[PDB]
Amino acid sequence: LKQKIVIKVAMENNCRSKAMALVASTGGVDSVALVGDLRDKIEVVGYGIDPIKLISALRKKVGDAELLQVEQAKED
Amino acid sequence: LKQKIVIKVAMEGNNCRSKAMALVASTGGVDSVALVGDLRDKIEVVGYGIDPIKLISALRKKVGDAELLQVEQ
Amino acid sequence: AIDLSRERDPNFFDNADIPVPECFWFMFKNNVRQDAGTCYSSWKMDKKVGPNWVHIKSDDNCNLSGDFPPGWIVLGKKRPGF
């Protein structure tokens, strides 16, 4: 079933549009959302997302990225 | 200025789904993008100063057809 | 110094097709708020708490326990409606 993950990415040109675009485009993604006190984190929910392949992809195209959270969906 | 926009898109495979979520998610002032519906064939976008006209226009150019189901504020 | 009754709610997005997480969490270093988000009650998440990954457990009233690095804590709260 579904994993919830939170990613801090550096977003200062349009690294905000790039990070969301890249994350949104990844296999198995159900939702991407700007979260955290400063809207500097991306929370991703889905199935079969490799967090490390995703951190790596972001670092390559956008700039710095850091996995900060993994939570399984509680289904009951 | 807080919007919810639900678009039905023709996404006939893994790639078209990816390309459409790429394009909605890249739009200025998007806070969140979610695949919605029992069949995951609708894109919910929430945010601020999103132009639904251009969003629809662009999708229509790139991935397949696109219909505006919902705009509420 | 830490009083959750005075902490503004976190920014969140509740995915439509998984259950709504019952708890708000709030991360402090030396009683300064660093971030906040949501997590399930009667559950567990893995969280980067400053330098270290922490396994954090939640009970049925959103009390969080975990091995926080010196100076740091993550504290829980029932969201409105749970």
Q: Got the DSSP string for A8-51?
A: EE-----HHHHHHHHHHTSTTEEEEEEETTTT-EEEEEESS--H
Report the relative pairing of strands A29-35 and A41-46 from DSSP bridges.
Answer: antiparallel
- Residue C60 touches partner A, C-beta closer than 8 Å: no
Say if the Cβ atoms of C21 and A43 lie within 8 Å.
Answer: no
The secondary element (H helix, E strand) that includes residue B14 is helix B14-26
B28 contact partners, CB below 8 Å, separation of at least 6: A17, B49, B50
- Among the listed residues A44, A53, A52, the one whose alpha carbon sits nearest the alpha carbon of residue A71: A44
Chain A residues touching chain B at CB-CB below 8 Å? 17-18, 20-27, 29-34, 39
- Residue C18 touches partner B, C-beta closer than 8 Å: no
Count of H helices and E strands in chain C?
0, 6
Q: Which two tokens stand for residue A54?
A: 């995703």
| Residues in chain B within 8 Å Cβ distance of A11 | none
Say if the Cβ atoms of A71 and C46 lie within 8 Å.
Answer: yes
Per the structure, the count of domains in chain C is 1
Q: Which two tokens stand for residue A67?
A: 């996995």
Q: Give me the residue label for tokens 């330098």.
A: C51
Say if the Cβ atoms of B32 and C13 lie within 8 Å.
Answer: yes
Which of C18, C36, C44 lies at the smallest CB-CB distance from A2?
Answer: C18
Residue C30 near residue C81 (C-beta atoms within 8 A): no
Q: Which two tokens stand for residue A6?
A: 């939170």
Gap between the Cα atoms of A22 and A25, Å rounded: 5
Gap between the Cα atoms of B26 and B23, Å rounded: 5
Say if the Cβ atoms of A32 and B33 lie within 8 Å.
Answer: yes
B14-26 and B52-62 are packed helices; what angle lies between their axes, rounded to 10 degrees?
Answer: 150
Q: How many CA atoms does the CB half-sphere of B8 hold within 13 Å? A: 7
Q: Residue C12 is part of which domain span?
A: 1-82
Q: Which two tokens stand for residue A29?
A: 């993604």
To 10 degrees, the CA torsion angle through B57, B63, B65, B66? -60
Residue B44 near residue B36 (C-beta atoms within 8 A): yes
